[PDB]
Request: fold
Amino acid sequence: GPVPSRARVYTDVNTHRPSEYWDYESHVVEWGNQDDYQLVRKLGRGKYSEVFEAINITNNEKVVVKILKPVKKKKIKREIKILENLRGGPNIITLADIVKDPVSRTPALVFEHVNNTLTDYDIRFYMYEILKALDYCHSMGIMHRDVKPHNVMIDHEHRKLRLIDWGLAEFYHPGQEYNVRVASRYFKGPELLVDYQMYDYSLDMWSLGCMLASMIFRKEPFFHGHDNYDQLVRIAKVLGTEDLYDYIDKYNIELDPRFNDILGRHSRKRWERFVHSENQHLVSPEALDFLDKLLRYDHQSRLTAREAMEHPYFYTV
Amino acid sequence: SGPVPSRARVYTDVNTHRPSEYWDYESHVVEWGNQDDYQLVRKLGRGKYSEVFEAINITNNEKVVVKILKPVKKKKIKREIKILENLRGGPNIITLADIVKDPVSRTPALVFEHVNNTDFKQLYQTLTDYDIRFYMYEILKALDYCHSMGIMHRDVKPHNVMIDHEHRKLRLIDWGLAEFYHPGQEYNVRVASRYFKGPELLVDYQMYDYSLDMWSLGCMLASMIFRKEPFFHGHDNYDQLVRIAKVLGTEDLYDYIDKYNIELDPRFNDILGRHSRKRWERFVHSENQHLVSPEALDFLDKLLRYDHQSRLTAREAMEHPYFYTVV
Ligand SMILES: CCc1ccccc1-c1ccc(CNCCc2nc3cc(Cl)c(Cl)cc3[nH]2)cc1Cl
Reply:
């Protein structure tokens, strides 16, 4: 079978905490009355959720209400426990309340309102704001597992950032085998794509690297896969096939036969080739060195959030 | 021309503004699962038309509580289930987990979350002023929630409050007497347990509301802070009003009946007498002085009022100085 792996940072943070912290299945959720919130308008719709702008009638404050389609109760307990553990943390969305409408009885989460609205400095600034949230949640023993631009809200007028949608987040336990059907296709780490289950917080750093590459190069998404197998091929077209085989061999990973006719052979490309007239004002040696240190096949060889915060790319923030 | 009408000062029209599916429990369709998934372990207690068992959910090896109902009134079972379903998941409300029937007996059974009830007597000896403020606040969270949901419990008493002291967890149980509040509705006064019956029930004033629960909570608070169980020890429902009048006085009882044009039952004529209004300080003794304070007495005085409209609502009670020391 596959070779075991563990996180280089915050490895045992949950092991040293009582089970009440991480045993979300045993968490008792107490649903308040949704009558204290008046729904104003529909903001958007997700896979098993509808998001509304609302007003808290007790204090006249605008909030956001996420009405969840309860397809999996254990998953709702997980998201609430994680939101409660992280409540008030730097750049983490604030869970304000947990309520149910008296008639429908549909689970609803109430969040702080974010008025969601670039230069080389703006990218360094906001990348540092995301790192504050990631180093915090990793220190809290939590992997987000769905880092992407849609899950990052920015109020640019107030230079405020929030990391949202904790629905795929999980608690990190060393040696635990996790479900690889996480994150969104363009941001899926190589470990998920090859079915390597013993992954960690480093999955989030790969996704952050995909975001940085798209911003500095103005190429959205950076790795444009059309399916999960193809997604690995798009990565291999940049990182090369030699280092992919070194990765699978290091961890004794069995490659799925679906990769046989599509993977091919690819050279490792240099980051400088993605620089063009339209993006050169956002690119620098420091930006490329930092990106190269995030986008690595081997999950263990990527910068941790703490390490990334010490990179020369952030000397100006 | 009869009694003066009355309505709740809070959550008055919460059911009026909801579709009938919410409160029309007679029309609620109950689906009963297979009780075979639960193995009964031991009998916990027995009530009037119910037997309570500790049981084990065989699908997950978790302890649960099974309440087997003697189906003497089907409408009442529908009422209890609809209320439990409406309140499910609310703060400190017992959680209805399942509704089942044994394949052979076909007897209605409700499955609840398990509460590890610490023995009260052991707790009673060691209870502190802080613990009483803490647990009283926990009951108020449950009452403000159920009143906001348009429901009166109508059977608030210590036997219906389960506390796991080790985990500082409290649950309000036995929703069998609970009812939906509709303004102007005349309710049956034969509810609540004798010692906890509000004056409205005792004088046969039918148009009562959520404030009935606040009187019963006041009876519990008085028994805890003064270590006098029960506080108002009536021997029958008429004598129960006399016990209250021996504390609250007869002057304010006549003001209450006059405000609502209530006709006092002739059975009170030879037993009520005349009684002065007592100071709450008179119930303080060496055995209970560590649980009493000016704030505790001011709060008690504001719950134990004849006039149901004059009592603090649950939300008002939560703002009282007595709770300044609780989170
Ligand atoms: C500090 C607590 C307090 C403050 C103010 C007023 C009263 C009390 C109080 C005093 C005692 C109790 C304990 N009630 C337990 C009743 C009970 N235990 C049960 C155990 C079982 Cl198994 C069953 Cl079936 C029913 C049960 N009902 C609850 C309470 Cl809430």
Observations:
- DSSP finds ten helices and ten strands in chain B.
- Chain B touches chain A through 16 residues (CB under 8 Å).
- The domain at 6-23+115-327 of chain B is CATH 1.10.510.10 (Transferase(Phosphotransferase); domain 1).
